[PDB]
Amino acid sequence: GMSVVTSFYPMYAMTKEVSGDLNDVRMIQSGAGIHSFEPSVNDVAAIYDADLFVYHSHTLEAWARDLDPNLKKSKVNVFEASKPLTLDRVKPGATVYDPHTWTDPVLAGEEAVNIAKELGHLDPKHKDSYTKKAKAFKKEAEQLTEEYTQKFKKVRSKTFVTQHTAFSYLAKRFGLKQLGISGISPEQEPSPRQLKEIQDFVKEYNVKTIFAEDNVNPKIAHAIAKSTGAKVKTLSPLEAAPSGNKTYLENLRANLEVLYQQLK
Ligand SMILES: [Zn+2]
C-alpha cells in the first residue's frame, strides 16, 4: 500500500491523481489557515508513522523542515514537492518568497511531475504507472494553459483585486496584474494606508471586481468594493479543499473561468 501523508489540498490532489489507486493518500489540513497552520502532536505522529509526507515548500509549511525522521527513529520520507521550482520574492528587495505557485497551471503541472518522481523512486514496481499519470496531468495542465492564455489575450481588462496575495503566479502567467487586499497570508491585514492604496489602485486600473474567498471575512472586501464601485465575487486560491468531486485541474479551470468572465 504505502502510507502517504499530505499537507493541504493542493499537495493532496496532485499526489493522489498521480498515485491513482496504488496507495492510500491522506490530508493533514483540509480546512483553512494553512498559512498559520501548526501541527498537533497527533499530526506529526501521523507524519512519522507514514511512509511519505508530502508538503509544498518550507516558505509556507515552515514547520515541516522541523520534522526529523532519523532522530525520531522513523522510516518516513519527508518530501518538499516545490523544491525544484523557483519562487519570486514577495517584494523587490525582500528576504521572503511567494509560495502560491500551484494556482499557475504550468508550475502545478510540474510540481505534480516531481511528486511522481518521488513515488516512483519509493515504489519502483510501479514507477511506470506514476510517470504515466503525471504526463496526463501535465498534458492537461498545458492544455488548460494554452486555453486561457488565448481567452485572456482577448480580454482588454487585465487587473483584479483578491482577498490575499495568492494569484501572482497565475496572473503573471496569463499577462494579468493583481493586487491582494492582504499579504501572502490572510492574517497580514492592511493598515489604513494600504487600504487607500488598494482603493487608488482599483481606481487607477478601473478594476471592477474584488474577489473574496470562502476562507476569510469579506467585510473589508465589500468595503473597498462599495467605495470604488466594484462588485464582489468569489475566487478560490485552492488552499482549502473544494466542495464537490472535481479533479484539481478541473477545480482550477473553474476558478480561472470565473476570472475570465469577470474580466470580460
Ligand atoms: Zn495563501
Author numbering: 32 to 124, 136 to 306
Paper text:
In order to elucidate the role of the flexible loop (Gly123-Leu138) in metal binding and laminin binding, a construct (ΔLmb) was made, replacing the loop region with a short linker (PGATV) and its structure was determined by molecular replacement using wt Lmb as a model. On comparison with wt Lmb, the backbone structure of ΔLmb including the regions at either ends of the deleted loop remains unaffected. These two structures superpose with an rms deviation of 0.4 Å for 247 Cα atoms. Surprisingly, the ΔLmb structure showed the presence of bound zinc, in contrast to two other deletion mutant structures of SBPs, namely ZnuA-Se and ZnuA-Syn, which were devoid of metal ion at the active site. However, only the primary zinc binding site has been located and no such secondary site is observed in Lmb, possibly because of the absence of histidines in the loop, which cannot coordinate an additional zinc ion. Another notable feature in ΔLmb is the packing of the two monomers in the crystallographic asymmetric unit which is different from that of the wt Lmb. In ΔLmb, the truncated loops of the two molecules face each other and form the interface. In contrast, in wt Lmb, the two monomers are oriented such that the loops face away from each other. It is noteworthy to mention that both wt and ΔLmb exist as a dimer in solution, as shown by gel filtration experiments, although the physiological relevance of such a dimeric assembly is not known. Our data conclusively shows that the loop spanning residues Gly123-Leu138 do not play a significant role in metal acquisition and the interaction with laminin.
Lmb is made of two domains with (α/β)4 topology and the domains are connected by a long disordered loop.
